[PDB]
Amino acid sequence: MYKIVSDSACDLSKEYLEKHDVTIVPLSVSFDGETYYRDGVDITRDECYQRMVDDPKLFPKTSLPSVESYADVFRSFVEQGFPVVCFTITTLFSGSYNSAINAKSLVLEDYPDANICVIDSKQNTVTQALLIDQFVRMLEDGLSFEQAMSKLDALMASARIFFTVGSLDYLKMGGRIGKVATAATGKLGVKPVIIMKDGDIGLGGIGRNRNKLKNSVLQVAKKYLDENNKDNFIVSVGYGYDKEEGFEFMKEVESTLDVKLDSETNVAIGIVSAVHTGPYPIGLGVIRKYETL
């Protein structure tokens, strides 16, 4: 029996965490740059979105989890004899992974025969949730840790997020915009269609109208799924401030792609991503079914 751990960027539902025994190590958010609140623990996802929606000039800051936060979780499981597997947001967005690496080392000092595996998921939000869920599936289906790890690279390489946001303001201010900043996207009124793959974000298209942008998101995903064998993928949706739009989007996804969503890994996009996307991200994530690899 493994104790699966993730940082809070994965956005897995309360229900999922209880059902599959996944433990979350929270990132923090600050609105004034002085006081920080642990994601989901000291503040709720809905409250954070509200602060941003109420104040379009407010740019909050995120902070990686402390080494001690990871260490206390690792330690409590390890002294019970549990092997630990810990997933983090992509190292290209956050130093979360390296906090966990330092925390593993800390715990080893006091428990030299401890089994702790730290994984740079190379994902975020929906695809981090999809990857964790593939791992949860493999272990529940009776694969050994080694058998599951032998599929990890291919799973991570196959993951994609296809999404759009309300503006470039938060991405630029938060420093992770990277290749999504171009001459075209810098023009007044334009929003990007964004693709997350291989641990980072890139530009998949542009537009101006919310509904047209969501249609472009779907067309970009459809091309990828068609190329790679749609039947062999799990598909889930992530939504931001407007839950109704999210549910309606899920219908468009199922209709356009001719799939049924895996609802367990649908996510209300969390604070970690929202601080950087703004309160209006919407999109879908996909990942290969391990069985097909």
Which lies closer to ligand STE via its Cβ, residue 139 or residue 238? 238
Return the structure tokens found at 275.
Answer: 């601080």
Contact 130/159 with Cβ under 8 angstroms? yes
| Strand ranges in the chain using DSSP code E only, listed in sequence order | 3-7, 22-25, 28-30, 36-38, 61-63, 84-88, 116-120, 160-164, 191-197, 200-207, 233-239, 267-268, 282-288
Give the residue with the Cβ less far from ligand STE, 40 or 283: 283
93 touching ligand STE, by CB under 6 A: yes
State the nearest-atom distance from the C-beta of 240 to ligand STE, in Å. 8
Q: Furthest-apart CA pair in the chain: how many Å?
A: 57
**Contact range with ligand STE by CB under 6 A, out of 58-66, 145-153, 183-191, 250-258:** 58-66
Cα-based angle 56, 253, 53 (whole degrees, multiple of 5): 10
Residues in region 224-253 near ligand STE by CB under 6 A: 238
Say whether residue 90 binds ligand STE (CB under 6 A).
no
Are the CB atoms for 236 and 129 separated by under 8 Å? yes
Q: Which is nearer to ligand STE, 126 or 193 (CB)?
A: 126
Sole binder of ligand STE in the list 12, 38, 43, 62 (CB under 6 A) = 62
Return the residue matching tokens 């990277």. Answer: 178
Q: Which residues contact 263 (CB under 8 A, 6 or more apart)?
A: 236
Is residue 163 close enough to count as binding ligand STE by CB under 6 A? yes
Q: Measured on CA atoms in the order 37, 39, 41, 47, is the torsion positive or negative?
A: positive
Contact region with ligand STE (CB under 6 A), list: 35-43, 49-57, 119-127, 184-192? 119-127
In the list 96, 158, 185, 265, the residue contacting ligand STE (rule: CB under 6 A) is 96
Closer residue to ligand STE in complex, CB, 148/250: 250
Q: Which residues bind ligand STE (CB under 6 A)?
A: 27, 62-64, 93-96, 124-126, 161, 163, 176, 196, 201, 238, 269, 272-273, 276-277, 281, 283-285
